[PDB]
Amino acid sequence: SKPNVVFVLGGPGSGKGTQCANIVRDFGWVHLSAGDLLRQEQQSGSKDGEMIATMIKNGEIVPSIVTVKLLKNAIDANQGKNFLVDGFPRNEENNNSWEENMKDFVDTKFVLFFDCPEEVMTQRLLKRGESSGRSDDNIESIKKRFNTFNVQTKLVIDHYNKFDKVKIIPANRDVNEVYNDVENLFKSMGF
Ligand SMILES: Nc1ncnc2c1ncn2[C@@H]1O[C@H](COP(=O)(O)OP(=O)(O)O)[C@@H](O)[C@H]1O
Ligand SMILES: Nc1ccn([C@@H]2O[C@H](COP(=O)(O)O)[C@@H](O)[C@H]2O)c(=O)n1
Ligand SMILES: [Mg+2]
């Protein structure tokens, strides 16, 4: 059987990695964070590394040929699993490249959208910034990540919503309250 795929979207610091860890724990899906895979690719000393580094710091979206390749490598290595793909698609190019490369391999089911205010997301990330040692957890970068979300990614969420394919969870609540709804949703979808 073809894998089920759920895209996990929402702003920087909306809690995507956090909720995805919980789903992995209770449902046994594999968690693919596109941002983390792109970091890993840079730390592994490829030709694209200096490119990826710069784009991450500036909150720009890497060319899809890089990203879709890393997601596909991991997907092909885990036959018989279902996938949470987190922080992807972030723009139209991401999306077109997914449907060009993945369409008859996967059953992409819905977009799980974590809706959260910008001011709350800012505070979360400045707190993760003390200990994360990430290049994009400073105020300069966070604001660049917001704008890219606003200009590029919001259009993608709209696209999936006109096919009734977006499920929205409000994420400005306690972590366990947010997970309660996430778990209820995944159970109701038959997973
Ligand atoms: N519901 C929440 N309330 C408060 N802190 C949270 C909540 N969800 C996540 N966090 C914290 O917010 C920060 C960002 O979480 P993360 O899952 O990495 O976000 P994303 O992947 O969407 O950028 C982390 O420090 C995390 O521990
Ligand atoms: N689909 C994706 C996902 C992440 N990214 C890059 O990785 C950065 C970090 O992503 P996360 O916030 O999701 O960890 C993004 O802000 C962006 O610069 C990307 O270029 N393409
Ligand atoms: Mg993340």
**Distance from the alpha carbon of residue 136 to the mean position of ligand 3, in angstroms:** 11
| Cα–Cα distance for residue pair 56/36, rounded to 1 Å | 10
Contact 144, 58 (CB under 8 A): yes
Range of the structural domain that residue 116 is part of: 1-191
CATH number at residue 167: 3.40.50.300
Ligand 1 site-directed mutation target among 18, 38, 123, 175, most atoms within 8 Å of CB:
18
Check whether 173 is labelled as a binding-site residue.
yes
| Cα–Cα distance for residue pair 85/33, rounded to 1 Å | 6
| Cα–Cα distance for residue pair 111/146, rounded to 1 Å | 19
Check whether 25 is labelled as a binding-site residue.
no
Residues 6+ apart with CB under 8 A from 137: 125, 126, 128, 129
Which residues line the pocket of ligand 2, CB cutoff 6 A?
Answer: 12, 34-35, 38, 55-56, 59-62, 67, 87-88, 90, 94, 136, 145
Structure method: X-ray
| Cα–Cα distance for residue pair 41/53, rounded to 1 Å | 10
Contact 135, 56 (CB under 8 A): yes
| Cα–Cα distance for residue pair 78/106, rounded to 1 Å | 13
Residue nearest to atom 1 of ligand 1 (CA): 175
CA distances from 145 to 26, 136, 155, 167 (A): 30, 8, 15, 22
Q: Is 26 exposed, middle or buried (0-12, 13-18, 19+ CB in 10 A)?
A: middle
Regarding the beta carbon of 145 and ligand 1, being less than 6 Å apart is answered no
Peptide bond into 89 cis (omega under 30): yes
DSSP class per residue in 27-61 = H--EEEEHHHHHHHHHHTT-TTHHHHHHHHHTTPP
Based on the structure, what is the number of domains in the chain?
1
Contact 85, 34 (CB under 8 A): yes
Regarding the beta carbon of 31 and ligand 1, being less than 6 Å apart is answered no
Ion ligand 3 nearby residues (CB, 5 A): 17
Contact 86, 117 (CB under 8 A): no
